[model samples]
Target: HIEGRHMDLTISNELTGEIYGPIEVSEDMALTDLIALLQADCGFDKTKHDLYYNMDILDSNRTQSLKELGLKTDDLLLIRGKISNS
Candidate 1:
């Protein structure tokens, strides 16, 4: 079994239609860490954001890795700015 591998994912801005990455990340990297990385790389604010995989919400607070989310190399993930009630 492979102990370490990297997965490539493309994250997009759902509202603005801006896309970022085929960024390579460790398979063990948590969704939370991915969020922070996205913030740093693309100016995404995690506080008011949500991520989805094929219409299902991907919770950043989960301890699962990207590989656990069923992401294969070159998979596409979507990010959206959350709508406030106010």
Candidate 2:
């Protein structure tokens, strides 16, 4: 069997988006880790990727206190986990 590991995301330019995670981490990787991952895996620039969460997506009245967390729309990026076991 072969292992095909990659990243995926459901996004929108104006409003909605989804971030899947269990994000692959390489030895205590930081935000910059995503930059290298993009180039090597999907040919995207890490800087181009957003890092903040959207306030509208998670309204202040929502169940969770995500709003208080101060996650901006740009910070909503979620790198999916490494898929395996083919």
Candidate 3:
């Protein structure tokens, strides 16, 4: 489902700096929509990583994505089949 709709999703360099996946989506897409987008785009199996609720780390002006939770701006998001040659 995710793979059918979006493309050009890049990997974020956060923890496990080798990880990947930070897919850009249409602004019209809701938070839950983005989650579905990522799940489908990443081809994640239902059992391995299931859908759940989201949580905010702190009450501030910051409006980070659910993916951004606990993830620094420089963190890496490891994606399957994606590898760096550097």
Candidate 4:
């Protein structure tokens, strides 16, 4: 198998229609790590935000990589909805 390369993605605050991107991400990076990184990068509340892909709620913290989720460059992830843990 071939190693994956970096992915450039756009992030949107679905609630506000605010868009941010094209952030560089590594396909090998973990889902949880990316969420945290994005939360900081986008100034989102911790653990209160999550990543939403096309029909897929990428709510994982099990070392799942973007490559494993079939993510590609220029993809869009939405900061949708919310959690009550805050």
Candidate 4 per-residue lDDT, tens place, 1-86, comes to 33349878788888778989778889888887888787678876646666689956776555788888888885788887666435
Query: Which regions of candidate 3 fall more than 4 Å away from where they truly are?
Result: 1-13, 19-22, 43-86
lDDT of 1 by residue, 1-86 (tens): 22348867788888788988788888888888988898888787767888888888887688888778877776788887677555
Model 3 residue-pair collision total: 14
Better of 1 and 3 by lDDT: 1
Writing each residue's lDDT as its tens digit, candidate 2 over 1-85 gives 3222332222323222433433443323333544455456544333443332333322212333323443333343433222324
lDDT of 3 by residue, 1-86 (tens): 34422333444322234444455554344445544555666554333433322221222223445344433233233423223456
lDDT ranking from best candidate downward = 1, 4, 3, 2
> Could you tell me how far off, in angstroms, the CA of residue 48 lies in candidate 2 after the best superposition?
5.4
**Candidate 4 residue-wise lDDT at 57:** 71
Candidate that beats the other on TM-score, 1 or 2, i.e. the better one: 1
lDDT of 2: 0.35
Winning candidate number (TM-score): 1
Q: List RMSD in Å for every model shown.
A: 3.6, 14.3, 11.3, 4.4
Q: In model 1, which regions exceed 4 Å deviation?
A: 1-4, 84-86
Off by over 4 Å in 2: 1-23, 46-86
